[PDB]
Structures are given as C-alpha cells and as structure tokens.
C-alpha cells in the first residue's frame, strides 16, 4: 500500500531541507520506520542472497534468529527496532559457521554511555531462546553522529554485510572462538576498524573518525569506494556541507533520498 503521491512530496521536502539547512534539527526516524518494509523489500529484490528481515523488537529479533537457524539458513541480516517508546534501528549479521551460530549486533553510533548494559540485555534475550553453540557480540562503529539516521545507516550496512561476506569471515570466526570481545562487554570502535572493510565507512560523519580508520588501514585512504572512481576521502568531501563554519556530512541524508527515489522508479 505504498502511497506514491505522499512519498513524492516527502522526497522534495528532504532535498529542500538539505538546501536551507533545516535538515540538522529535523527528525526523520518516524518516516524511515514507515518506509522500512518497502525499503527492505526493495533491498531483497536487488540482492536475492541478502536475506534481510525487518523486526520491530528485540523479542521479535531473537525469535527470528531461532527461526532462521531452524530453517537451515546460514546467512541472514536483521533490521531491528530496539526501542519501545522510541525508534532505534540497528543491524544484526547472522552467520552459521562450522556447527556454531554467530550473531553480531552493529551499532552505527557510539556506545560509551549505556553500551555494556544494552549488550548484556540483548545477549540474555538471545540466551533465553536457548540456541546451542550460539555466540553473540555487539560492535560499536561510531560513524553516525547525526540525530535521526539510524535506519539509513543500518539499511546500508545490511547490504554491505552481504557484499563483504568473505571479508567478514574473520570477525564471525573470532566471535565463535570467543577471541573478539573477551573481557570487554562489547567491541569498541578502534577494535572494529581492524576487522571491518572500507565500504562500511562511506557514510562516516566525521573527518577525524575517518582518520582513525585509515590509521588502522593505511591503504583505505586511497581506495576506490564506488563506480565514480573516487576514494574514501574524495567521496567524504563530495558529500559534505558548510554550516556555521563547520564541515558536516549529509551523505546519509542523501542516501535516504536515493533509497526513497528508488521506490518511485518503475
């Protein structure tokens, strides 16, 4: 029941809000949530091996993780709204390897505040489903800094989790062998940079944050990240804006527009 008329009006507002600069203090979470079923359906059609599911609670996630394992599926992703009275959409990567099940929750933003608690909450929720040889880990990325782009980041990462399948074997392997987080509750960002490929950081909202990634991956600076033959750095600049003498990235905001426009295309 996609209301194309309404969506078309929305797309124009998004572009307008970028030009007048009001985008920064507007929340797009509610609209992302509403559009997500269509956006997920769109992603799956584009990538049949993606196996993306949209779940609207932690309970629906862990019970879906149980289902997916039961059906013999070995590779899947989940967009999960973890919030109750609010919206917080994260992405989970699911991978069975050898006999053991790997579940990794990726948080696009930081986790310094209540990271440990939330990680333990989600871990325990999954333990209650009682999956044998099931290992869980939560990963901090700290690449989202904008206020309402959790959905876009998670949707984009979901598709990258598929495309970077082989590059993500190691982090899943270390999760299973319990060599990933160890003593620490979740995986901090600096540790994550050593595991994850360049394509995950295309929408990074912070020049300093990118400098931290390339310090862990020297070649990442001058690596082509798209068909427009622009490097990670070159792309970061080509999707930035000036507001009050501060360089900000509207990459994720532009990605929302791309995602919405694709639903309109026949």
Ligand X SMILES: CC(C)(COP(=O)(O)OP(=O)(O)OC[C@H]1O[C@@H](n2cnc3c(N)ncnc32)[C@H](O)[C@@H]1OP(=O)(O)O)[C@@H](O)C(=O)NCCC(=O)NCCS
Ligand Y SMILES: O=P(O)(O)O[C@H]1[C@@H](OP(=O)(O)O)[C@@H](OP(=O)(O)O)[C@@H](OP(=O)(O)O)[C@@H](OP(=O)(O)O)[C@@H]1OP(=O)(O)O
User: Which residues sit at the interface with ligand Y, rule CB under 6 A?
Assistant: 156, 159, 163, 202, 226-228, 255
CB 78 within 8 A of CB 61: yes
Q: Where are the beta strands (DSSP E) in 152-199?
A: none
Tell me if residue 71 is catalytic.
Answer: no
CA angle 40, 45, 50 (to 5 degrees): 70
Binding residue for ligand X (CB under 6 A) from 83, 116, 197, 206?
Answer: 206
Q: Which of the residues 29, 134, 140, 150 is marked catalytic?
A: 150
Quickly count helices (H) and strands (E) in the chain: 10, 7
Sequence-distant (≥ 6) Cβ neighbours of residue 116 within 8 angstroms: 185, 186
By three-state DSSP, how is residue 177 classified?
A: coil
Cα–Cα distance for residue pair 190/198, rounded to 1 Å: 14
Over the window 119 to 158, marking each residue x when it contacts ligand X by CB under 6 A and - when it does not, the resulting string is --------------------------xx------------
- What Rg do the C-alpha atoms of the chain give, in angstroms? 18
Whether 217 has a binding-site annotation, put simply, is no
Of 61 and 143, which has the nearer Cβ to ligand X? 143
**Is 144 within any annotated ligand binding site?**
no
Binding test (CB under 6 A) with ligand X, winner from 7, 207, 216, 263: 207
CB of 74 to ligand Y, least distance (A): 21
State the nearest-atom distance from the C-beta of 219 to ligand Y, in Å: 18
Q: Sheet containing 100-107: give its strands across.
A: 52-55, 75-81, 89-97, 100-107, 134-140
Distance CA 81, CA 88 (A): 5
User: Closest approach of Cβ 266 to ligand Y, in Å?
Assistant: 16
261 assigned to a ligand binding site: no
Shorter beta-carbon distance to ligand X: residue 3 or 112: 112
Q: Is 88 a catalytic residue?
A: yes
Between 107 and 174, name the residue whose CB sits nearer to ligand Y: 107
Cβ atoms within 10 Å of 232's Cβ, excluding its own: 23
208 near ligand X, rule: CB under 6 A = yes
Please confirm, yes or no, whether 1 is among the known catalytic residues: no
CB of 226 to ligand Y, least distance (A): 3
> How far is the C-alpha of 103 from the C-alpha of 134, rounded, in Å?
8
As annotated, the active-site residues are: 88, 107, 150
> Annotated binding site for CoA, which residues?
145, 207-208
Q: Where on the chain is the footprint of ligand X (CB under 6 A)?
A: 24, 145-146, 205-209, 248-249
């Amino acid at each position: 029941e996609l209301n194309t008329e309404a969506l078309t009006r929305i797309v124009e507002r998004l572009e307008s809000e970028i030009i007048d600069g009001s985008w920064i203090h507007i929340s797009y979470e509610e609209t992302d949530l509403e559009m997500m079923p269509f956006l997920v359906a769109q992603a799956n059609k584009k990538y049949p091996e993606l196996n993306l599911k949209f779940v609207m609670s932690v309970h629906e996630l862990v019970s879906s993780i149980k289902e997916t394992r039961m059906e013999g599926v070995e590779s899947a992703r989940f967009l999960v709204n973890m919030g109750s009275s609010g919206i917080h959409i994260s992405v989970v990567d699911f991978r069975v390897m050898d006999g053991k099940t790997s579940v990794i929750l990726f948080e696009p933003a930081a986790c310094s505040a209540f990271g440990p608690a939330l990680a333990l909450r989600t871990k325990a929720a999954l333990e209650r489903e009682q999956l044998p040889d099931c290992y869980f880990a939560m990963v901090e990325l700290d690449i989202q800094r904008s206020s309402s782009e959790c959905g876009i980041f998670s949707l984009a990462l979901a598709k990258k989790l598929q495309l970077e399948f082989m590059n993500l074997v190691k982090i899943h392997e270390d999760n299973i062998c319990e060599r990933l987080c160890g003593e620490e509750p979740f995986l901090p960002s600096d540790k994550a940079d050593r595991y994850l490929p360049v394509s995950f950081y295309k929408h990074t909202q912070g020049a300093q944050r990118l400098n931290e990634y390339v310090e862990a991956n020297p070649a990442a600076g001058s690596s082509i990240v798209n068909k427009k033959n622009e490097t990670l750095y070159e792309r970061f600049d080509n999707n930035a804006v000036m507001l009050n003498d501060k360089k900000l990235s509207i990459s994720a905001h532009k990605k929302r527009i791309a995602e919405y426009k694709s639903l309109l295309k026949p």
